[PDB]
Design an enzyme around this catalytic site. Structure first.
Site: not given
Length: 361
Positions: A334-336
């Site tokens: 989710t960070c990328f």
């Protein structure tokens, strides 16, 4: 458990069943809006906040409540107050500020925000504060997991994931059961770390990262929120649903999403992605948000749509890539904003596998 729609309905009637006669006045000037609100609501008793809500600006009228909730939800995020900070760049990953103690009454303010967030839920009104799913897990008494660290803190994830495999003897670092905390200027022993008790150490670290420095403040927030709306009433919801109830659903633009998608080991002409967009088209809007939550960590689009989408490391567009074994469930980073989609042999499997992953993982 049941469909969200059913859960919301069951939650609504519980609010309404416990609603109470007459009303409450909270009048606030737009400059003094945060202070006003503060004093008023803290001087009011938590129960009184379940009554009918009458809000006056002193000036005019108009509608007025939705603004108040909107404005005040932005105003608490003002770094001027040191209540909330962002872990990453460009407003990525909202969280309680460890240096909030800079002001000695900070807990009363967190208790105030508690009540405020409970009013928003109890009275059916939306906020745009931008809490993250792990914040919502804690409101549901859910332990944040190893993958939730990836959402908030990618580098810390990678160092833990590395620690998980391979002895570590091929190492020069002891890694005691202790952590340093640099705040405002600053059973329980060093212990021995072993192949066996890495699994203990990792849990304690995973727990620690989410809780570090923000312990009485988080407690203050919840006793906050509880005084007004019991946390019991939320028990049947998952975090993604809780976020949904507070932020509100909106119409996803399937065109904007498909134009603003990049690829690794894949192309638009590739067959997995043709099937992927076929199932996303086949979805109703509640599932499309669920997918967006699954992939980005939130149900709210940034201003400018899918093109202006940010990750942990600045601007980061939605991306699918050929990763994982087939017969594996697709997984997000989710960070990328990345989706690992295995090269499934047929549309049918992928469709089956995607829906379960979105709903169950």
């Amino acid at each position: 458990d049941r469909s969200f729609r059913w859960k919301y309905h069951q939650f609504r009637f519980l609010c309404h069943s416990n609603a109470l006669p007459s009303h409450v006045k909270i009048s606030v000037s737009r400059q003094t809006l945060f202070e006003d609100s503060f004093q008023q609501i803290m001087n009011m008793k938590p129960y009184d906040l379940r009554r009918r809500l009458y809000i006056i600006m002193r000036g005019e009228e108009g509608g007025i409540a939705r603004e108040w909730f909107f404005l005040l939800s932005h105003e608490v995020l003002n770094p001027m107050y040191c209540l909330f900070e962002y872990a990453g760049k460009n407003n990525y990953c909202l969280q309680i500020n460890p240096a909030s103690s800079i002001n000695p009454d900070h807990l009363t303010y967190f208790r105030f925000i508690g009540r405020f967030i409970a009013m928003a839920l109890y009275h059916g009104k939306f906020i745009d504060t931008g809490f993250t799913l792990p914040f919502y897990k804690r409101m549901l008494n859910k332990r944040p997991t190893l993958k939730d660290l990836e959402s908030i803190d990618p580098e810390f994830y990678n160092s833990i994931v590395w620690i998980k495999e391979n002895n570590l003897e091929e190492c020069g670092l002891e890694l005691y059961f202790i952590q340093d905390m640099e705040i405002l200027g600053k059973g329980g022993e060093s212990i021995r770390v072993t192949e066996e008790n890495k699994e203990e150490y990792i849990m304690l670290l995973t727990d620690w990262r989410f809780t570090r420095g923000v312990e009485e403040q988080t407690k203050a927030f919840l006793d906050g929120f509880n005084e007004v709306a019991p946390l019991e009433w939320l028990r049947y919801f998952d975090e993604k649903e809780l976020e949904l109830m507070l932020c509100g659903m909106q119409e996803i633009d399937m065109s904007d999403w498909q134009k603003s998608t990049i690829y690794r080991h894949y192309t638009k002409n590739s067959k997995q992605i043709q099937w992927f967009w076929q199932v996303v088209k086949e979805m109703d809007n509640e599932k499309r948000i669920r997918l967006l939550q699954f992939v980005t960590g939130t149900c709210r689009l940034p201003v400018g749509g899918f093109a202006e989408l940010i990750g942990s490391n600045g601007p980061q567009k939605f991306c699918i890539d050929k990763v994982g074994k087939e017969t594996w469930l697709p997984r997000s980073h989710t960070c990328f904003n990345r989706l690992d989609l295995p090269p499934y042999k047929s549309y049918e499997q992928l469709r089956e596998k995607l829906l379960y992953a979105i709903e169950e993982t």
